[PDB]
Structure formats: C-alpha cells, structure tokens
Ligand binder design. Structure first.
Ligand SMILES: *[C@@H]1O[C@H](CO)[C@@H](O[C@@H]2O[C@H](CO)[C@@H](O[C@@H]3O[C@H](CO)[C@@H](O)[C@H](O[C@H]4O[C@H](CO)[C@@H](O)[C@H](O)[C@@H]4O)[C@@H]3O)[C@H](O)[C@H]2NC(C)=O)[C@H](O)[C@H]1NC(C)=O
Ligand SMILES: *[C@@H]1O[C@H](CO)[C@@H](O[C@@H]2O[C@H](CO)[C@@H](O)[C@H](O)[C@H]2NC(C)=O)[C@H](O)[C@H]1NC(C)=O
Ligand SMILES: *[C@@H]1O[C@H](CO)[C@@H](O[C@@H]2O[C@H](CO)[C@@H](O)[C@H](O)[C@H]2NC(C)=O)[C@H](O)[C@H]1NC(C)=O
Ligand SMILES: *[C@@H]1O[C@H](CO)[C@@H](O[C@@H]2O[C@H](CO)[C@@H](O)[C@H](O)[C@H]2NC(C)=O)[C@H](O)[C@H]1NC(C)=O
Ligand SMILES: CC(=O)N[C@@H]1[C@@H](O)[C@H](O)[C@@H](CO)O[C@H]1O
Ligand SMILES: OC[C@H]1NC[C@H](O)[C@@H](O)[C@@H]1O
Ligand SMILES: OC[C@H]1NC[C@H](O)[C@@H](O)[C@@H]1O
Lengths: 391, 390
C-alpha cells in the first residue's frame, strides 16, 4: 500500500492472544478488555523501554464494541468497559508518544459477533479518523462470497485514504480467501500495509512449527511480494507468556526478524521475565527485522531435522537462521560452507560473522573457502550476522 | 517385588533421553557415553545437593556394551569408552555414597543392537552382581513371542534374587506386551520393582500431555497395583533440558509426585538453570512423591480444558494438582468445593491448605463448606497440600 506507512514492518502490541475476549470485569478485572488495560499497557511500554526498542502501536483487538451502533449509524465503545470512549483513550495514548490501533470486521459481525463494517465502510473509516486511530486490523469473519470479501477489503482501503489520515491498514484478506482459491498477493499488496496469511497462533511450539512450516512451504508465492509498505503477517509475538521454552522463544524472535514479519507482542507486559524482556528488546535483532532494504528471508535448506533460513540485509549484510527440529537428545552439530551462504556473496572474499542468538558472540573472520561449525539446541535457533570485508 | 527395595519410588539419574546413543567420542567428547560422563555426573550429584535431595542411583542406559561377550561367557564394557570396566566404575560410584545402575535386554540384542541377555540370564545376573551393580533396567527389544517376553522377564528376576545382592529390578514388560494383549499388572508387580507402561519420552510438552493423557485413561487398570515395592513408570524427568517451558516443567514435577512415579533425571547436570535445579530439588515436592504410605494418585475430574488430580498421603494429608490444558489466553480461574476433595475426608471438619507449586504459599484454613479458588497458568499446574484439621 503506497501510503507512506510501514516503510519497515510495524511494531507494537495487541491484546488478542493473551487477553482474548474476556468481558467479565466482575471476577476477572485484571484481564477484561477495559480502557484501564490499555491505559496500563501504554503506561508501561514507555517506562520499560518498549518504545525505545521501537514498539509504537498499542492495538485494541476484537471485543471493544457496544451491542449496536448509536443513532446516526456509528460504532460505539462499551459504555461499561470503555466509559471514556475511544476519543479520550486516543488522546491519552498519544500523549504518551504512542500510536493507537483498533479492530473491525469486513462482514456483518466481528468474529465475536459485534457489528460488522459492511454497508458502513465509508462511515466507520471516518468515525475512526475522527477518534485519532493510527491503525486498523480489518478482520474477515461473516462473509457470504469471495466477491464481498474482495470488494469489502478494497473499499475500506479507499475510505481510509480519503479520510485524510495516516492509518496503517492491516488486512486478513488472504487467510479467509485461502480455503477457496489462491490469493492474488500482487493485488493484495496494493491495498494493505500487511496481510495475515495462516491460522491463528497459540501459546504452542506446535503452532509456531506449523506457521514456519506452512510459510516456508509456499514461500515461492509470498517472499517476493514482501517489501516496504507491504508485509507478510505470520501473526503475533507470543514470547513472554507460558507455552514456549527459552529456545522456542528464540526460535520465534529469530525467525520473525528473518521473515520480515511485523512485531506485535501479545502479552501481559506487567508480568514478564527479565529473560523475555531482554529478548523482546534485543537491539541487534530488532535491526535485522527492521532492515531498511526490506527483502523477506526464506528457507535456504532443509533436512536431517535441521533448517536453514537466511535474509539479505542492506550493505552486503545477511542474516542466517539455523533451526534444529529434533526434539530429543542434546545440542547437535550442523555445518556448511559459507560458499553456500547469501547466494555466495557475503563471504566473497571473506565475511565477519558474529552470533546474535541464543547469545551475543563475535566469531572470527571467514574466508570464502571456510565452513561454519555450530551446535544448535533442540527446538532452538542460532542466529548469525554475516558482514562484508575485504580484510 | 518383595525384595526389601523401592520401598518409596527410586530416585536418581539416567543418561538416555539427554545423551542417547552417542558413541562418537572423537567429535562430541562431552556427550559420548564414556566412563568420564558418569564420573562427572556422579561427582556433581554429590556437590550440587542432588544426593541430599534424595537422588541416589546413577544409571547407565543402553549403549555401554562391547560388540560381543568375552570367552566365557560374559558381557563386556566398551574397551575404548569404558577402559576401566564397570567393576571400577562401581567402586568409584560407591565411594561417593551413590549406587550405580546398568542396562540390558530381554532379547537377542539391545534396542541398539548390542548382545541381549537371552540364554545368558543366569550368567548376566551374576556378572552384574560381581561388579556391584545396584540397579538393572531390563529392556524388551528383539523378542519373537510374548511367551519369551514373559519367561525372560521372570527368569531374570529369580536370577538376580539368587545372586544374593540387593539389585533394584526395573522392567519394561508391559510396554512391550501392550500392543498385543493387556498386561497382568498383578503378576508383573510380583517380579518387578517398577514397570515402564507407555512410549518413550521426548523433550516435548506434547509427549508429556500424551503420557498423562494415556495414564489417566487407563488408571482403572494401574493405579491400584501401585505401592511400596512396585511402581508405575511414566519415564524420565526431562526438566532442565530445552523443550519445556517453566509451567511445563512444573506440570511435570507435580504430576510425577502425584503419580508416585520414580524420579529419574535425564539431563546434563553440568549445565542447568537455577530455575530447574531448585525445582528438581524441591523438598516439599519430593516429600509428596516420597510419601511413606505409597498410594498412587489419580484423575479426580476433567473437562473445561482443566484437569484435577489428587493423591492421598499418610496422616490425613492429600495432594491436589490442578492442570490447565488451554494453550491460549492467560491465567484461568478454576474452583471446586473442598467437599469434593480427597473423597471427602481432608477438610472434614476443615483443612490447612498450603500451595507448593508454582510458588510455595500458605493459604488460610478451609472449612468443610468452603470452595477453593484458583488461577492456573496455561499448561501449568497448581499443586496444593491439604492437612485435615483434626
Ligand atoms: C492516499 O492516496 C494516495 C494513493 O496512493 C497516496 O499518495 C501517495 O502518497 C505517497 C506519500 O509519500 C507518495 O509517495 C511519495 O512519492 C514522492 C516522490 O514523487 C516522495 O516525495 C515520497 O518519498 C518519501 O518516501 C520515499 C520512498 O521510500 C523515501 O525514499 C523518501 O525519503 C520520502 O520521505 C514518496 O515516495 C506518492 O507519490 C503518492 N501517490 C500519488 C497518488 O501520487 C497518499 O499519500 C494517501 N494519503 C493518505 C492520507 O492516506
Ligand atoms: C532370539 O532369536 C532366535 C532366532 O535365531 C530365537 O531362537 C529361535 O526362535 C524360533 C521362534 O521364533 C524357534 O522356532 C527356533 O527353534 C529358535 N532357533 C534356534 C536355532 O534355536 C530366540 O528364542 C530369540 N529369542 C527372543 C526372546 O526373541
Ligand atoms: C529374594 O526373595 C525374598 C522373598 O521374596 C526376599 O525376602 C523378603 O525380603 C525383605 C528383606 O529381606 C524382608 O523384609 C521380607 O520379610 C522378605 N520376605 C520373605 C518371603 O522372606 C529377599 O530379600 C530376596 N533376596 C535377595 C537378596 O534378593
Ligand atoms: C494375573 O496373575 C495373578 C498372579 O499370578 C493371578 O492370581 C493368582 O491366581 C492363582 C490361581 O490361578 C491363585 O492361586 C493365586 O493366589 C493368585 N496369586 C495372587 C497372590 O494373587 C490372577 O488371577 C491374574 N489376573 C487376572 C484377572 O487374570
Ligand atoms: C456482507 C453481507 O453478507 N451482508 C448482508 C447481506 O448479504 C444481506 O443482503 C443482508 C441480509 O442478510 O444483510 C447484510
Ligand atoms: O476475534 C477473531 C480474530 N481472528 C484472527 C485475529 O488474530 C484476531 O485478532 C481476530 O480478532
Ligand atoms: O534402546 C534403549 C531404549 N529403548 C527404549 C526404552 O523405552 C528406552 O528408555 C531405552 O533406554
């Protein structure tokens, strides 16, 4: 989407995977979708260095609506859980130096069942723009035919542009189109800052595996569409929660940066391990995700329950991610000739390889002729940066 | 097995899951099955407080044999990876105040392919007893028919008793027998200090779930056989390794204590988080696994992606483990009336409930009439101890 926005992949936070559709403020106040929730997440992002890291978009997800619309025809917040309305939440958010994201649906209902945007595309867009929204997640539940999905998705893009406001439009167009026919990513790219590709994400090394595996499966179709202003969305960062071990949390971080995925944390910020914070806030690794060049990574090689990913970065740099898919035994050794790395460019005549994950460590120089040895942890990932030189 | 042994479930450590059958000492010396491996694990168990915790059995698994037997007769260690022989390893291990375990097979070959024990039952047994072995894992690969499995398993048990030596006999009888016919656990109990029931274990929350899920599935059949001298083995403690998150590692610890499973750590002791060390060495939680009464726990209730387990302990005590199987969102609330707990005994007229896991915390008194409230972590377990008034 030629809108000036998402020049690198959007970073921020999103309630869904951690807070889902909890609307019982009575017994579970500390996790119902209330303004205070975002009031508090926002408040933190600032004080805990999430902004300096580069997370900027506090994003509301599904389950913020009232039962129905006011009498014009406009979406409202919940009067109970959002007494102050979005108008003020926006104001507050902004004062913190952040941007606010919101949710709505292409259909007749959200995936939860609160009013859809259909028929109301023109009016929702403006309604949002009046509030001070800086992002939209546009979901695609409750849709008759592909024709409505397509026209609906497109029609919203136009209505947002018209408002006059810089609003990151994030779409789920392909995910929903998928089961019926291949999506025209070329065309999608035209209307959406970024698009959701596969199933929802869990707190499971299983779910992760299946995303990478499905992603890598049809990379031929998606890696190339990806660049400045339009990204492949493999869904939220779940690091900080419960489901993944350390090496699985690295694997997540590494491959999201490799894949040039947007980085949307979905977690209680108020209870997070030094572990994960420091991982989530890794300067070097955010860089790689955030590389100005904007070429998506891919799966170079595979087999022997090992996986090789790599991403080209600007300045003759390249990222190498090596995964170990054997769940059993110990650290396994895996080695390749740097001759096979970066299509053969980085490391001609030589490259400087420093390791970023699981721990930050310079490794020597590396002639064209040489091989890189390595011990990767079961279900973990080793993340290298290869630099050019000349020495 | 009426042998004076495993009066509470055996604790120690086992190479397999973490080190497997790595025999390449050239390129991976830090993890090949070498005496120095056991020399090192032993040395640590001592210094790191693993012994004081109650881990006592340093256990060699598969892949310690030579190509073939001496002439006699007898099984040998690898000349290269075990130059000093088991004789000496035993001696050393003992001097640390620990007990050595070894491995062999019912069949013609181990699961790897090194000589089986068949035909050699009488001689293997003695061989081991000469070496000073204190445990045997008897595996059941490479077996024609169930008859040989049965007779082979049994025959060994007698040969061991006869040696004259206290040797904890750990069998894999049921697991192999399964896929053909239900096992007679009554019978097995008679010959084995503990028995492996299900598939191997991985470094996966998957694998865990499936073990509990399979165990609770047929608890009818197995929970009652269990008690002093004969345990159900749900396979190794894998905490400390790579594959499980914290709340998954607690879930494992809690439910191993609930189940009255033996505690066999399989990990590199030389590189382990404070996290895991403290969890593996939890006094209170070992106690519950170690309760002298020795009744196995079971699944009280299930549904709503929540699971309630409970074990009765001596002295009107009971353990309650509540697991949360929803892998999404956050801490879920789950509650029941203490009236339902421990068949209705603990908490009549009242109980003291202190939480052990995830963090050790007293909770007040709990009248008969009261319900216990609780926020359990996704894939975690909350593990309580109920003391009845009284
Ligand atoms: C909605 O309507 C249109 C529909 O596409 C959209 O117009 C486009 O807006 C962008 C806004 O930047 C324009 O892109 C610019 O093109 C000119 C060159 O002619 C440059 O000034 C801009 O350069 C910036 O970005 C560069 C690209 O990487 C950077 O290198 C550089 O540093 C600059 O900062 C940018 O390329 C584009 O020309 C128009 N297209 C049209 C229709 O003419 C509009 O912005 C949208 N409006 C809203 C409110 O959503
Ligand atoms: C180990 O393998 C040998 C086969 O070489 C078994 O001995 C034979 O087993 C078959 C039964 O399937 C008998 O019919 C033969 O008479 C035996 N052959 C000989 C030459 O003695 C042996 O019992 C096997 N044992 C186990 C437990 O698998
Ligand atoms: C071999 O078998 C006998 C009988 O099962 C074991 O005897 C029991 O051993 C414990 C410890 O000696 C006693 O507490 C029980 O009272 C014994 N019961 C019987 C039947 O006498 C014996 O210990 C075993 N011996 C060895 C060394 O393996
Ligand atoms: C499983 O085997 C057990 C143990 O042998 C069987 O119980 C024995 O049965 C014999 C008669 O066949 C009795 O005389 C013994 O007293 C029993 N042993 C003991 C001490 O219990 C048992 O019947 C078998 N189980 C089933 C249900 O098939
Ligand atoms: C996107 C969508 O399907 N919207 C529906 C439309 O099909 C239908 O004409 C009407 C009654 O169902 O209400 C609305
Ligand atoms: O609630 C439905 C759900 N579909 C998929 C998205 O991840 C989520 O935010 C959206 O709200
Ligand atoms: O190969 C030996 C190996 N076979 C499978 C068993 O279950 C495992 O624990 C044993 O050590």
């Amino acid at each position: 989407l030629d809108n000036g926005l998402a020049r690198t992949p959007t970073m921020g936070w999103l309630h869904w995977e951690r807070f889902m559709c909890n609307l019982d403020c009575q017994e579970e106040p500390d996790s119902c979708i209330s303004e205070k929730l975002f009031m508090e997440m926002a408040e933190l992002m600032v004080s805990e260095g999430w902004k300096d890291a580069g997370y900027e978009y506090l994003c509301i997800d599904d389950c913020w609506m009232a039962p129905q619309r006011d009498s014009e025809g406009r979406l409202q917040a919940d009067p109970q859980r959002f007494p102050h309305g979005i108008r003020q939440l926006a104001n507050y958010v902004h004062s913190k130096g952040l941007k606010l994201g919101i949710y709505a649906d292409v259909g007749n209902k959200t995936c939860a069942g609160f009013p859809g945007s259909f028929g109301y595309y023109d009016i929702d867009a403006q309604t949002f723009a009046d509030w001070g929204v800086d992002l939209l997640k546009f979901d695609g539940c409750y849709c008759d035919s592909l024709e409505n999905l397509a026209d609906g998705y497109k029609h919203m893009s136009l209505a947002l542009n018209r408002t006059g406001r810089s609003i990151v439009y994030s779409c789920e167009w392909p995910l929903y189109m998928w089961p019926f026919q291949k999506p025209n990513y070329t065309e999608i790219r035209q209307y959406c800052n970024h698009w959701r590709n596969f199933a929802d994400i869990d707190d499971s090394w299983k779910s992760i595996k299946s995303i990478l595996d499905w992603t890598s499966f049809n990379q031929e179709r998606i890696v190339d569409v990806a660049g400045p202003g339009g990204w492949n969305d493999p869904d939220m960062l779940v690091i900080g929660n419960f489901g993944l071990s350390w090496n699985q949390q690295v694997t997540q971080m590494a491959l999201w940066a490799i894949m040039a995925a947007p980085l949307f944390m979905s977690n209680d910020l108020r209870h997070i391990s030094p572990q994960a914070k420091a991982l989530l806030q890794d300067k070097d690794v955010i860089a790689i995700n955030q590389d100005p060049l904007g070429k998506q990574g891919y799966q170079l090689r595979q087999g022997d329950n090992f996986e090789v990913w790599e991403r080209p970065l600007s300045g003759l740099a390249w990222a190498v991610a090596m995964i170990n898919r054997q769940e059993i035994g110990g650290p396994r050794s895996y080695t390749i000739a740097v001759a096979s790395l970066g299509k053969g460019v980085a490391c001609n005549p030589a490259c400087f390889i420093t390791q970023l994950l699981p721990v930050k460590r310079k490794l020597g120089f590396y002639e064209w002729t040489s091989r890189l040895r390595s011990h990767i942890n079961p279900t973990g990932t080793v993340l290298l940066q290869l630099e050019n030189t000349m020495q």
